[PDB]
Each structure stands twice: as structure tokens, then as C-alpha cells.
Amino acid sequence: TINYYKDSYAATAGKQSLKQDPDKFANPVK
Amino acid sequence: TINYYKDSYAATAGKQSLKQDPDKFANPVK
Amino acid sequence: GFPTELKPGTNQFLTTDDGVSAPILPNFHPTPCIHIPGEVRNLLELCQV
Amino acid sequence: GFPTELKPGTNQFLTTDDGVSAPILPNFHPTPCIHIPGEVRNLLELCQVETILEVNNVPTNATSLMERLRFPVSAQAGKGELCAVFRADPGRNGPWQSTLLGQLCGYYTQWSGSLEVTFMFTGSFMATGKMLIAYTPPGGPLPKDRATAMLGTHVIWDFGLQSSVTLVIPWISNTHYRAHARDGVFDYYTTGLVSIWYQTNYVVPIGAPNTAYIIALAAAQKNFTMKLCKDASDILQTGTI
Amino acid sequence: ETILEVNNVPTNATSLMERLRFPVSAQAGKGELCAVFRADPGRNGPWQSTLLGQLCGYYTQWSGSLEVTFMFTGSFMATGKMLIAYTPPGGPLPKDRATAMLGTHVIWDFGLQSSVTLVIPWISNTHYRAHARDGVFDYYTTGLVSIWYQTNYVVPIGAPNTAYIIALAAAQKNFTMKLCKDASDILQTGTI
Amino acid sequence: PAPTGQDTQVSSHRLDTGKVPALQAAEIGASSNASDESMIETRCVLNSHSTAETTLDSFFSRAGLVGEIDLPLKGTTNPNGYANWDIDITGYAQMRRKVELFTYMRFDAEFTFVACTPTGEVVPQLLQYMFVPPGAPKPDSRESLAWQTATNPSVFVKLSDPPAQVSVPFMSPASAYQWFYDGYPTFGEHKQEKDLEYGACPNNMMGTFSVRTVGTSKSKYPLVVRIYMRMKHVRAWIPRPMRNQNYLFKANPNYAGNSIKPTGTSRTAITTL
Amino acid sequence: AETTLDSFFSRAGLVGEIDLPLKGTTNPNGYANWDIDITGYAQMRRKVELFTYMRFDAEFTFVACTPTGEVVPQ
Amino acid sequence: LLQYMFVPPGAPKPDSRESLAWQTATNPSVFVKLSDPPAQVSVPFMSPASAYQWFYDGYPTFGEHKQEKDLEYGACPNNMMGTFSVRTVGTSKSKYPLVVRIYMRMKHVRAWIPRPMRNQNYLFKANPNYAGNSIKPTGTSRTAITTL
Amino acid sequence: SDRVAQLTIGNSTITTQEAANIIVGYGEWPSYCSDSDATAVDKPTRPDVSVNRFYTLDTKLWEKSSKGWYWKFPDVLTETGVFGQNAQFHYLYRSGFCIHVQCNASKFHQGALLVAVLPEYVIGTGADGFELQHPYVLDAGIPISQLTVCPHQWINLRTNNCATIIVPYINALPFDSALNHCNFGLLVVPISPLDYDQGATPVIPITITLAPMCSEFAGLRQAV
Amino acid sequence: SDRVAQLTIGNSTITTQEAANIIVGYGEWPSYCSDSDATAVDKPTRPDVSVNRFYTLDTKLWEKSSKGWYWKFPDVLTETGVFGQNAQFHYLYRSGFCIHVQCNASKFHQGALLVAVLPEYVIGTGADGFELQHPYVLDAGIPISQLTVCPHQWINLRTNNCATIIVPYINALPFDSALNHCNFGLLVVPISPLDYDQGATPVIPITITLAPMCSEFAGLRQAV
Ligand SMILES: CCCCCCCCCCCCC/C=C\[C@H](O)[C@H](N)CO
């Protein structure tokens, strides 16, 4: 993220973290 | 190469590496 | 903000210039490149045939 | 020189921006600052000072404008009569508009915290009695009798040497913050109601006055916070000054 | 997995629910055909009714293996077997079962376990495929899917003669998409 | 982690009784688990396809139209050079269908305003965009006293300059925005009138947008303003099925009951392509 | 952090107005003199009058245009 | 004022000046004015194949190639990258005729398998067709071989 | 082993001999409000055993031409049991839910149901539930074929006769009112129509049973 | 555990939920020709995946008065698939076989089949098979009651609905021609006749599926 002001919500989107949890919706079986 | 964004394909052309393989087309004899 | 100055070369489109531009597709990854025989790395390589 | 590019945000004058500008007086030194008592470092410091609340905001004429600061109390037939009710919404127009907390809260959209209302008795020394003050959370309408009002959180006030009691309105809500309540859709943020009921009577011997008055002071607790600064809803001018 | 609309024949308002299943009954045991469709997620057709099909419309190119699951919802005493075949690109629609059995296929047996899954492996010449459409863009067609009677649909006396099958489709663990674009459908007819 | 797609391992034929990857029971409610290397004979493939374009930020950080304001010279809408626009996103289908896939979202914003004449020509003119939070005094004319913007943020810009843009934080009292609200906003009896407030969530009403041409008398050009919105730092929860039929009203799932249409296309027979 | 003095006062507000008409009686000679005062408008005055003594710097911004809002080279 | 919109294959193509597809909810778009310096963007490599090819000896469909398919001889789907859309932002007709010129520059270039260069004039796009009746030598000509 | 099942909580018990395992909604068991999530200042009440038990709501019949039914939560229980009494005597409410759907037939019947839970079910145009008018678009303009993205189960008459779903508290606020907001709605739609030949029993009732889990209340006042 | 079964080879898969285990012919899995057994001097070709897969041949009906059917191997596959093309383009051939017979009915049907493999089935006096005329003497002067000495399985309609046999290469030569010699013949005879009461489904088809294993070819020439 690149920022030029004093507020964190004025920065760029940046690069997220590649994580997946496909079992939350596909395999919710106890 | 000089880059100002998060994407590598937005950079400058830069300076390549000077290598030649003239024997590939001129002397392909086994 | 930071005070700057403009030199007499602005707003011109120079064809041979090497510059940086804003990408249109964020986070794009191209198709991988397989090995293809017969690669040219210099126009002088095929100037001796 | 250095090649640059212009982003689509130039030449705009944004009022809330924080920026650097060229000074007009080079090498200027201001007058030294001496110690002056009574410095404020936060608008929340003076949001916890009790101020008079206008529960009895009935009258309107010029000569009786002072009667809005207190409401009367006298002897009844001992049937648990009602005294006064109002809504405990600091930002909504009403009795709370006369306090410093109410005026300051108009500058901020959302608030959160616990309030506190203090009642003081200003009768003769020989007059005694007890009152019940109840706070009905949202959802329940105005109580129709004391036996229905006693269900919510309440405090019993006893007249005596200590002439003041404080009813604390705890922060009970579903959301973390509340916007200012108003009639219509924005009633979703209503905080509740406050009622005052006679407990036993207002007893007074012979030779003493039959009517007394109560003064109510309101303030905020130590967890009171506000955010999202805006402009007030009232403009105090009718043209050029 | 989401419900797939293989039987997208009807159109009227009162029978719009009949598109979610296709019927199955007893025949003369000659290897009759049941239903066919194209296995192109992005191309308009049966796949347009799934979440995978709708999401894929937002991305130009995709790659990976698909998976279609069939569930039998008949009586307990009805038994039978079916053959499901997937014809890779190049071969036209099979004219009979003996021609369809050449491609990759699975034999489904009715029983206690009422569901079988046919996996459509990623078989292609290019690393990615664009969305297929009629005309030049048929170059990216994935193939066809067919369902054939194996032996029969056998049922004793006192039990129903017609049953239905429900098909659910999804994607495998190597499914990827790229080159975000806008959808081809706009859900407004003026100002809202 | 999942930086790339999964590989494929070498497999061979299997003829054994008791283990059946193919047969399943979808009545349980869980997706399949049989893979390619367990139903056909596969080879070894080293997958290196990136999955970075399908993230929430990669899918929502694109600008879209959400607003339209007209300031005509002769007409009936805003003939006084000022306009008031309540902040809503549900005004246009392309963005609405995208954002309605989920139930709760939490995000910042970047707003860009483009202004020009109805014919597309650019003329020298000055304006003032004013953000009016709920409970603030809303202007009622071109010379209203509320335009002093003593506390409310405001922007002064010209048509000939590049379009102005600002960054916007998350201002909801709740923990996230919600596009669906199954309930009513008041403790009333809900006889008939309250039904017009069905689904009206007070946590989504963020304020009002005000625009005027800076001046005392009437201007000389008709003007149009377009508001574009872009999302960043996006989080989502609880996805729901996507929209099927056309839209009719803002903040309402109403649909045309007499004209109901299937999701996709149709064919003649099930045994023929 | 939003209720501090800087967070409450560091917002721009109108304090002045100058007219330079072509035909009229106020300033028909193309020049004007304006004494520096803040008490000319209610929104800012009510805000600043909450206290008795203040000590602060300032940042002044001047916006100029024709009475109709049009921008001309001058 | 204008609006350049990049339409990938399969996206809705606009059909008028006020088309609903101009909301550019997902497709990249650029707003710019004539009086401003010319706009420019950077573009990645979007082919499904490993490289672009300017010659394709074959057909793109499994058909029978009777006569109609011969109009698709050499049509490579791996080179059709999309559509470019331009309009003047407004409701009514504009007041000036306009012309747009598109310039292209290459970077990070790799090449394979060189072939002999072109000799005759061009006739059609994506077609090596040439005028058969008017065939010309590569260079210039002289009168005799023993004289310069 | 996942064919017999017994679920007990409070002072009620449910048994079934043909089950289809148990679906946990979004892979999270219900829990209490943590000290960091809370916003109230008054200590809440947790009646525990007196409000966490199985309740039977009503019985609906399955016909060969039925469309479907849906219910709303927690609107159904506001007039039933100690849970109802506490709901109207308090302003803030939170809880989880365990839902059990029962429908049994013989071996010569056929048909299938789709049991699913859809949070924030806004309906476009009590404890007994309503009947859908346009089941294809879920009465809200969304196709039913994509409903499986929500926690769901199937009732296949040849395989099982029951479905179980466990749903935690789903909302953007730690506490909310139970008389003005419905967190989710339960849907039961017949995808494959019921069929049988004449002479078999033609009545195939469907009954709904459910039980709150980990309830909490705050903000005492008069009953409303 | 030997009641469900899945057999996969190449790019085809077969599933069954009522099996009767698997019979391995003469207790030997198919294998390749060892270097000591070989006699040819040219290196053979092993197409592997392209010729080792399940093929479905034809469907025959089971009637209350049927006699029986028999097939010949590898004569059936010489005009089917890549196995057929390679058989006519090569002179020497060897392979194993895995054979699967499917026949299913309801619970109210009855009857039994005898599935067996008999090497070198010389017949006394294509891919669709033939029908026996004198099933008692196997059309070759030998009683059928002793057929069980060969690798065999039963199809009892009350117990199972399928039979599986794995047969290696059986011959006195390491390689042989596929167009002039039939190594073995498959027999399917109804010992107990089919029976049902009127109203049940009267069509009970029988279908044959099989797959070569570990094939080899040599001696390339023109197609014959
Ligand atoms: C220069 C001032 C302009 C800034 C004004 C924009 C700030 C507020 C934007 C709100 C962001 C979107 C969230 C709003 C709520 C929901 O989208 C809708 N009300 C849906 O009901």
C-alpha cells in the first residue's frame, strides 16, 4: 500500500493474501 | 527497468542482454 | 504541497520515448510460455544466412 | 526534468484537506504565551458538566420564559399520581435542547455512552416525601400507571438532608452507535422514556408552604463519545449582519 | 453443487418448475437415448442456471475440470442401470450407444447410494479456453454429454412407472478464471 | 494457502471391491470428493495458474456509474440551479447485480464526479459539491445560508479542470452494510402505512449530496453531473443466489409478476441439441 | 480523536464577501477595501464564540468568479 | 469529452450513444478531453495460446469445409482480442466532427521462426492475397548483364 | 454409523432410524457474546434449560400438486413457551437454532424435498407459515436452482426421512430485537412431485421441530 | 464389504452396489510375455491406454423360455475400436480379459444364470453372439452339469445382479493370430427359468461388458 496522507483509508487497494477455505460452504458436514 | 505501479507489465522496456546464437540458423548441420 | 516547475518539454507525444503508463488490468497473470524451437534474440543472427 | 503524471484530482479546493501553503511573513516570531488558567484540550472535557434541563417547556410568552427551568410538586390523594415525562434523546429536539451536551451533540452525527440526570429538591425543611423515577427501554410505550412503570430500571428518591439524587441512564442498545433520532423512519434510534411518579405523598405541617419545585441537571458519563462531525441544524441570522 | 437445467424445454408460466428434472421409465431394452447437452459452462444453454455458469460470465477465459452429479428420486423397489458418456471435441453426437461407449464414460447402478458423479476431465489443446459461441468461436467447444439406457427400468406390481433424475454441477479443485469483464445481460429496461 | 491451482498425480487402473469413490449420496448436502485421478487414468501435470484475479478486491475495485444529476435551464426538475440527491447505490443494474451477490459488506470508497453540458461540450463554469450528513441543514435554493459549509465537507471545482475525486471512509453505525433487511424499522403496529417501510434499514441511509453553480443569478449553460464509485478494502459475508428477473424499484426486490421468464435459453426437445 | 480542538476547528468556512460591479454605488472604480473581521457570518461565529481566548494560525483561500458563476480571463 | 471502452470478447457491445452498456461496471474505460494531452494505457498479453501467430495454416472448426468455411481459412481465434468502443459523452448530438488515431508500441518482445519478407502489395486484412495479373520483381532491372 | 440418530437438549429427545448426517451451518457452532463484542452495560439473563428445548409448531400436508412453504425465525416462537414470554419482556435477543424436519412414507412412494435456510429473506410481490405463489423465483426474483449455496439438505423418500440443520446467530449486531427483525427463513420446496398408485395411504404429513440454543436476553421492561 | 464394487481401467469406469466378489481365473493375473518365452525377433507394440478399456457389445433379452447364448473371444472386438484396428494391422496378438455381465430385476422376480468361461470351445453339429440349440449337451456332446469345473459365477436375482471374471492368456504358444483362433468362449445359460406374475415389468435385458488387459501386437503388415 502507498499512502501520502495521515489517514489509512486514503491509501491504495494493495495486494491481498491468497487464502481459501472451500470447505466452509462445500463440506459443512459434522 | 523503472516501475511506479504494482504490475510488472507497466514498466519500461529497459536494456536487454547482448547474446547471439548465429549457428542456429546458419550451421544446423549434425 | 511540494513546489515544482515545468520545463519546456511537456505535453508532447514522442514516438520513440520509453515511459511508464497506467495498467488497465489489475492483478493479471499471462499464459505460461512453453519451449518453442527457433528463437531469435538479435536481427544480426539471421543477417549471416 | 523529472517526468511526472497528473492524477484526476487536481485543481480542486477541498475544505477539510490538510495541506502546506506558502507563508506570507518570512522570519516572524509570535508573542510569547503566558499561563492562562482554564485550558480546554478536548470537547469531551466539558461534555461532563451538569447543566439545567428544561423538563417543563410548556410556556412560551416573554414574561414567563423563566418558568421553564422547574416543575411543581404538591400534595395529592396518595394514589400514585404522575408528575412529568419526557424522552431521553440528547440529539432530538425537546427538553434536552437547553443543555450544553444537547447543543454540542448537534455538531456530531453519532454518539454512544451513558447519560445521567440529577434532581434537586428546593422546598422547605419540614416537607418530606418520596418519588419514583423510571426509565423505560425502547419498545415499551409510555406507562399508564406506576405498577406498569416499575418493571424497568428505576430508583426511589427520598427527601432528606441530602437533597439530590442521580438517575443513571445506562447505555442499552442493539448497535454500537446511534444516530440522531427524529420522527418517522429515524425513530429506530429512540433511547426510551423517563417518568416520575409519586411514591407516598408530599407531607407538610401547619404553617409551611404547600407547593415546591424541582430542578433537574443532566450530563454524560465517562464513556461518552461522538464522531462524524457535521454542521448544526440552526442558523442564527436572518440576512446580512 | 447447484441444480442444472438439462430439461429446459418448457416455457410457460405454470410449468416453469418442470425444467429441473427429466423423466425416466421402462422401455423395450434396445439401448434408447435419454438426454443430451453441451458441456460448455459459458455458452448459453443448460449451464446458464447454475452459480458456476453465472459467475463464469464475468470472466473471459477459464480452465479446469468440471463435475456433474446425478441423483435418482424413484421408489425403493425400482432398479436399473444407465450409461453416461462424454464425447471430446471433434466427434459429432453419437447415433447409438455402441458409438458413444468409445469415449470416457461411467456406468451408474441404482441402489442404496442414489448418487453418482461423472467427472469431465480437462482435455484441451490450449492452456485456456474462451467462451464458446456459434460461428468462429466454436473452436473452444468442450464436447457433448449423453445418457443411455443400459438394461432397463424394472419395477414390480403396485409401484410407479415413471421416475425423475436431478443433476447437480460444480467445478474441481484446479478451476481458475481470469480477464474480468462485464456480463452480457442487463437487468433493466429503462429508469428504475 | 492457495496461490495456484492444484496439480494432478499419476494414477493407474484399480479393480477392487469395497471402496467406491464414484457412488455418492447427495441427500447429505455436501459437494463431491471424487477427483480426476480416481475415476479415469491420468498423468502428471504441474499447474501454475494464478488465482489472484478472483479475490474480492480484484473483483470489486472497478469504477461504476451510480448517479445522475440534471441542472437544466428550462424545465421542471431543478430550474433553480441547485439539486439534492440522496446517496443510494441501487439505482443502476450493472453495479447492483454485482454488489447484491452477498448480504453484508464492509468497504471504503473513491468517488469521481464528471461534469459536462448535455451535448458533451465543456464550458467554463464553477460549482460546489456539498456532503450533507443526516441531521444537517439541507439547502433549499441557490443562495441558501447553509452553503457556508462551516463544518460539512465541500469541494469547489471547474468544468475545464480534470474531474474531482475524494476518498470516503466507512460510516455505518453497524458492523457492515446490508442490502437486505427482513423487518421493520419502528416498533409500530404495521397496519398498512408501515409496509411502505418494509426493508427500510436506517443503517444504510448515509446522507445527502448537494450541488449548485456558484453565483447569485442564473447561469448560462445547462449542466449534467455523473457520479462514479469504486470499492477498496472489501470484505463480504454470506453469499446468496444471484438476481434473475428485471428490476422495478430502488431498494425493493419487486418483480413483474405477469411477465416471468426463465433464467437461460430454451430448446425444442431434450434429445436434440 | 475526533473531538480534539484541531479536529473540530480545522475546517474551512466563509468569512468574507467582496463585490466589484460595473454599474452601481459600492465599488465602481475597480478597487475595494475590507477590514479583517471574522464575526460577519453566523456559522463560523457561533463555533468560534464558544471560548473566550484562542491562539491559532490560519490558512486563507480566495475564490473569484463572475456574479453568474462564469470564469473569464482577468 | 469522450469515452474509450475496451470490450472483451463475449461482453455486451454498445449499439447507440445512450446504450445501457456504457455504465462500464467491469470493463475498463477512459474519460478524456480533446484539449488535454493524448491519453495512453499499458496493455498485457491476453492470449490463451503461448504467443500470437500471424499465420494459421488451417481452419477453426471441425466442419466439412465445403465452400463457406473457406472464408474462415486462416481465421485464428487466438488473435481476436476484443472490440474498441468510442462515443461522445452526452444525450444529444455533438457540434463537431471528430477523428481518433490509435498508435501502438511494443515492449518485452520475443520472436520465433523467421520467414521471408513480403514482396507484393497488400489487398485484404488477415489474408496473403495478391494481385495475380500484376506481378512485379523484388528489385529494379537493367538492360544487359554485362553492363552496369 | 450415520443412519441412526438421537438428539437431546433440555427435557426433550428426538430419535430417528434413517438419518442423513448433520449439517452445521457455515461450520460454526452457536456460542455466547464475547466481552469484546458486547455493547450493553447491563448483565443479560440466560434462562438455559427453560428456553432451550424442542418445540413442535404445526403440521402441513404434502399433496401431488403442492408448491412449497416457508417460515420465519424467530417470529414463530414469540407466542410459545417461556421463550415467547421472555422475548416480549426483553428488548435485546440473541440465540442459535437447531431445526429438524420430519416426513416419512412407505417404500412404494416417491418424491424429493429441498430443505434450506436463507438469511434475510426479503419477500417481494406467524407460527403456521405461508405458501409460496411463484416457487420458481422464490417469490423474490432469484432462481431456486442456486439455493444450494445456502445450508441445505434433501429428503429423498427412498433414502431417508429427516433433515437436520444447525444455524448460529447471523446478524451484523451483537444483539437485536426479536419483534421487528427476522434473522432467517426456512424453506421446504418439493422438487420432484409425490407419486403413488391408488390403494396406498394418500396422506403424507410434514411436521417441523426446532430448538433454540444458547439464548440470551437483556433490557427488561413491560410486556409488549 | 464385498457388496459394493468399482472397477476402472483406461478411461472407463463400472460401478455396482450388489456384487458377488471377483473370480480370478486359475489364480493368475494377466502379465506380459517374458524374455524366455518369446520367439519373435521384432519389438512388439503395447498401445496400453488406447486398447485397455471397457467395451459394451450388445443387449440380449431374457424370456421365460430362453435357452442360452455364447460368445467367442477375441472375435467380438476385431471390428470395434483401436483394438480392432490393431488386430487387423498385426499378425501376432496376446492379451488378457476382464469380463462383466449385468442383469438386474426387482425383488418379485426369480431366476438364476450360469456364467462360465470354457477355453477352446469347439462347436459340433460375430459380436452379437449365438443361441444354443441343445443346451443340455453344450452343443458339443458334454453335459452342462460339469461346467462348474471351469471358472464360473452365478447370477441369483435375489442375491446379486452381476458377475466378474478375470481370465489371463490361455494358449500353448506365446503369440497367436487373432483372426484365425478363438482362445475361449463365454457361456450364459438360464438354469432356473425366469418367473413373475402379470403386472410386473416383463423386459429383463442382459448386457455384456469386457476389457482387454496387457495387450501386445507384433508383425506389422497391411490391413487384412
Ligand atoms: C464530496 C462529498 C461526496 C461524498 C459522498 C459519498 C459518501 C457516502 C457514500 C456511501 C457509500 C455507499 C453506502 C451507502 C449505502 C447503501 O449503498 C445504500 N443506501 C443501499 O441501501
Ligand SMILES: CCCCCCCCCCCCC/C=C\[C@H](O)[C@H](N)CO
Ligand atoms: C482503453 C482500452 C484500449 C485497449 C485495447 C487494446 C488491447 C488489445 C490489443 C491487442 C494487441 C495486439 C494483438 C492482437 C491481435 C493481432 O494483432 C491481430 N488480431 C492479428 O490477427
